[PDB]
Structure formats: structure tokens, C-alpha cells
Amino acid sequence: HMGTIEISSPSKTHILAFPFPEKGHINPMLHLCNRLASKGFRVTLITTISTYKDVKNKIINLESIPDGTDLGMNGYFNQFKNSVTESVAGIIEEYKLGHDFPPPKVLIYDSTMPWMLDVAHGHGILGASLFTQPCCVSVVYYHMLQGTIDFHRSSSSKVLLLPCLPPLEDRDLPEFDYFKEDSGFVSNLLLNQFLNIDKIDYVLFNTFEMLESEIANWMSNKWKILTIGPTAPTAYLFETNTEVCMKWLDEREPNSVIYVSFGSIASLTEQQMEEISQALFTTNFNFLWVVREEERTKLPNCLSSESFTTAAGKLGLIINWCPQLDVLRHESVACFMTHCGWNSTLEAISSGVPMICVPQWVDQTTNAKFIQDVWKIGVRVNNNGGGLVKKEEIERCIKEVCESEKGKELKRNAMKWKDLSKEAVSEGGSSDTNLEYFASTLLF
Numbered sequence: 295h296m297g298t299i300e301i302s303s304p305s306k307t308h309i310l311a312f313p314f315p316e317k318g319h320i321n322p323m324l325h326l327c328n329r330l331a332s333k334g335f336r337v338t339l340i341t342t343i344s345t346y347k348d349v350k351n352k353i354i355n356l357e358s359i360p361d362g363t364d365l366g367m368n369g370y371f372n373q374f375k376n377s378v379t380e381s382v383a384g385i386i387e388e389y390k391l392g393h394d395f396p397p398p399k400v401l402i403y404d405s406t407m408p409w410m411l412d413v414a415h416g417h418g419i420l421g422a423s424l425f426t427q428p429c430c431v432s433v434v435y436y437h438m439l440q441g442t443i444d445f446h447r448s449s450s451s452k453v454l455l456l457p458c459l460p461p462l463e464d465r466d467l468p469e470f471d472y473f474k475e476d477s478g479f480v481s482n483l484l485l486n487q488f489l490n491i492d493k494i495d496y497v498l499f500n501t502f503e504m505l506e507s508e509i510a511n512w513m514s515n516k517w518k519i520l521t522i523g524p525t526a527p528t529a530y531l532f533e534t535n536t537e538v539c540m541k542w543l544d545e546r547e548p549n550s551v552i553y554v555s556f557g558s559i560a561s562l563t564e565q566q567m568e569e570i571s572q573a574l575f576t577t578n579f580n581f582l583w584v585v586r587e588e589e590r591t592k593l594p595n596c597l598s599s600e601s602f603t604t605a606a607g608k609l610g611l612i613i614n615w616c617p618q619l620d621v622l623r624h625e626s627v628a629c630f631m632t633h634c635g636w637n638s639t640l641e642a643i644s645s646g647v648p649m650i651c652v653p654q655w656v657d658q659t660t661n662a663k664f665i666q667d668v669w670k671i672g673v674r675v676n677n678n679g680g681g682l683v684k685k686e687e688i689e690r691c692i693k694e695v696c697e698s699e700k701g702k703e704l705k706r707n708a709m710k711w712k713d714l715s716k717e718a719v720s721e722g723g724s725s726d727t728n729l730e731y732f733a734s735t736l737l738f
């Protein structure tokens with residue numbers, strides 16, 4: 295007969311998001327923010343000023359913070375941690391005292407920044423840790439943290455058996471020694487994702503349960519992890535060179551283009567670029583090869599963008615960046631020569647594109663193991679077993695993926711996993727359900 299009703303809805307719930315300022319961490323966070331804004335949430339993405347321009351063009355409320363850094367990996371990272379700890383706390387407190395927006399309910403922060411949980415909890419809001427790597431390699435990091443099995447790795451070969459994982463050869467383990475005297479720092483960075491795993495309010499993984507069933511269930515029983523991937527949309531984020539790349543691809547034959555990208559960070563030696571060049575300029579396919587501006591000088595002196603007719607009569611384009619998700623979904627693309635970063639790997643899965651795996655370090659070695667031997671949607675190159683990958687090896691892997699009956703089955707496998715990733719994020723799918731569990735319980 296008389297009183298007041300209070301309605302908690304997405305439209306009056308405010309979600310803060312803070313990615314690590316690198317594209318493989320920014321991009322999956324942005325995709326997740328877009329899905330959350332689509333459910334009606336007020337979403338504020340926080341990012342460093344030197345990434346603010348990039349994020350501004352791709353896209354949601356946007357907020358910049360100082361880069362926090364002036365310097366090797368450690369000094370860079372400790373300054374970073376100290377600076378963003380204060381600036382994000384300031385943003386949280388300002389949005390508490392505001393009146394236009396709702397006060398923040400939760401901070402979604404990158405899993406490699408676990409101290410951000412103390413920032414969120416210290417300011418009275420929930421924390422959600424977004425893991426940007428698959429379940430299988432993340433569990434390895436946990437076991438390395440637990441200091442149980444010896445992971446130290448030339449007088450023998452070792453094979454490691456961990457619960458709910460296929461046996462892992464030494465080459466299958468996440469690769470840190472590439473970083474030499476910084477291997478400890480990079481190692482610590484990935485291991486420490488688990489330092490406070492039991493105190494995190496939501497543990498988010500950009501993967502889908504059918505892809506990693508055994509290990510996801512294992513993790514789900516230990517922690518209440520929510521697999522919510524792929525966060526990228528199925529068949530928004532507007533990448534640079536979009537019109538140029540789509541026009542070039544629209545003029546190619548179906549299933550005729552090898553797409554080549556080594557991600558946003560990896561840098562191959564100039565001898566390694568030469569092997570890749572000679573392979574691509576003599577194969578029976580067109581090619582689209584992303585060579586970042588800062589990497590152009592490692593190209594063979596033989597050669598913003600550049601067009602080629604190849605020695606096989608085909609066409610090549612070398613470009614400094616591309617809308618990778620749109621490239622992968624283009625009918626012209628036959629396969630994806632990739633460094634096996636997790637976003638690249640999962641984007642290719644969601645697109646049905648088989649892979650040639652040229653992994654460089656951290657999780658890319660483990661991902662390539664799963665791409666070839668578990669999901670069976672690619673072939674991994676063979677290095678002296680850090681070793682150079684020769685043009686004849688790359689050529690062997692192209693002919694296998696694109697010119698053999700085995701390649702036809704890898705393509706069938708990849709269309710099967712493509713359908714499964716689409717079902718995961720559709721209504722009733724495992725990832726849609728876990729993302730809704732996140733959204734719905736935020737309202738409680």
C-alpha cells in the first residue's frame with residue numbers, strides 16, 4: 295500500500311576497466327567492454343595517455359592516466375605499478391563523489407596487475423581479474439608458482455605431466471629464457487597472477503569451455519573461474535589500414551592469401567625475416583604480411599605499405615598494421631602464419647583459419663603445442679631445435695597446411711572449432727552464461 299521500490303539495473307551500474315597498456319591486453323578488454331556496454335552497463339575504460347589515442351580511434355567512457363614511466367623492464371615496471379596504483383585510486387574516488395555517473399561497482403583489471411585488487415578492495419569496490427591467456431598455459435604458471443615440480447630446464451630431454459594437461463615437452467613450456475637476465479622478471483610477472491587468486495571477486499578467462507574442457511573444469515573446481523571468451527564479436531573496434539587491406543583482399547581469389555603477422559611486440563632477427571621473405575616470395579599463394587614500422591629495417595634490403603608481384607606470379611602486400619579480425623574472416627585468406635599470441639590464436643579459431651605456428655616466447659610455445667596436437671588446427675615449425683626457422687621449413691609447413699590432404703582436415707577441424715566458439719558466446723552458450731552470471735550478480 296505504501297513505500298519505495300529500488301531498482302538495480304545495468305543502466306545504473308558503473309564498471310571500471312583497466313588493461314595493461316599493450317595491444318594483446320588492451321584489445322580483449324575493449325571487446326569485453328563493448329559486450330558489457332551492450333547489456334546496458336555504464337563502462338569506463340581507463341588507459342595510459344600514450345595508448346589513449348589508439349584506444350580513442352578504435353572505439354564507452356574513456357579516461358586517460360599518465361604513462362607513469364620515464365629504463366629497463368624492471369625500473370619501467372615498478373614506476374608503472376606505483377604510478378597507476380595512485381592514479382586509478384584517484385579515478386575511483388572521483389567517480390564515487392560524482393553525480394553524473396553511478397559510483398563504480400567493480401574494477402576489471404588485467405590479471406598481470408594483481409595489486410589492483412588491493413586498490414579496488416581498499417576503495418570498497420569489487421575486483422575482477424581478466425586473464426588474457428588460455429587456461430592451459432595459466433595453470434602451468436600456477437604450478438610454477440607453487441614451486442612443486444622442478445621446472446628448471448642439455449644432457450637429457452624432460453617431459454612434464456600436470457593434471458588435466460597433455461604431456462609437455464621442454465619446447466612446449468612457456469618460454470622465458472629468451473629474455474636472458476630478465477627471464478626472472480617476466481617469469482615473476484606471469485606467476486604472480488595467482489598470488490591472490492582466492493581473494494579475487496571474479497576470475498575472468500578469455501576462452502571458451504569446449505576448447506579447454508578438462509583444464510577449465512579442473513580450475514573451476516579450485517577457483518570459481520568464468521570462461522567468457524572469445525570476447526571479440528562473432529560474424530566495435532576499427533583498426534588502422536582497414537579500407538586499404540579490405541580492398542586488396544576483395545581483389546584476391548578465394549582461399550588464396552597467406553596472412554602473416556607476428557603480433558605487436560615480437561621482433562624477429564634480420565636473418566629470420568630473410569627466411570620468411572624468400573618463402574613468401576616463392577610460394578603458390580598471395581600474401582599479406584604485417585611488418586610494423588619499427589621492424590621495416592630488418593627486412594632484406596631487396597625491398598607505409600608496399601606491393602609486390604612474386605617470383606611465382608602471385609601478389610604480396612607488406613603493410614605496417616591491419617584490421618586483423620576482419621582479415622582473418624575474409625574469404626580470400628587460406629591460412630595464418632602467426633607467432634601464436636593468445637588473441638591471434640583465439641581470433642583465428644573464431645574465424646576458422648588454420649595456422650602455421652612460429653612461436654617466439656612466453657605462452658606462444660604452449661599455444662602452438664595445443665594448436666598442432668590438441669585442437670589440430672595448425673602445424674608448428676621446427677627451428678637447431680631460439681633457433682632459426684629456415685625457408686625450406688616454412689615452405690614445408692605451407693604445403694602441408696594449404697597443399698595437402700592433411701591441410702584439408704586441419705581446415706575442417708578449424709571450421710568445427712569456429713562453430714563451437716560461436717555457440718559458446720551465443721544465447722545459452724557456456725561463455726554467454728558465464729558473462730551473464732558476472733553481469734547479473736553485479737546487480738545483487
Ligand SMILES: O=c1ccn([C@@H]2O[C@H](COP(=O)(O)OP(=O)(O)O[C@H]3O[C@H](CO)[C@@H](O)[C@H](O)[C@H]3O)[C@@H](O)[C@H]2O)c(=O)[nH]1
Binds near residue numbers: 657
Ligand atoms: O596487424 C595486426 C596485428 C595484430 N593485431 C591485433 O593485436 C593483438 C595481438 O595480440 P596477441 O596475438 O596476443 O599478441 P601480442 O601482441 O604478442 O600480445 C601479448 O600479450 C598476449 C596476451 O596476454 C599474449 O598472448 C602474447 O603472447 C603477448 O606477446 C590481437 O588483438 C590482434 O588482432 C591487429 O589488430 N593488427
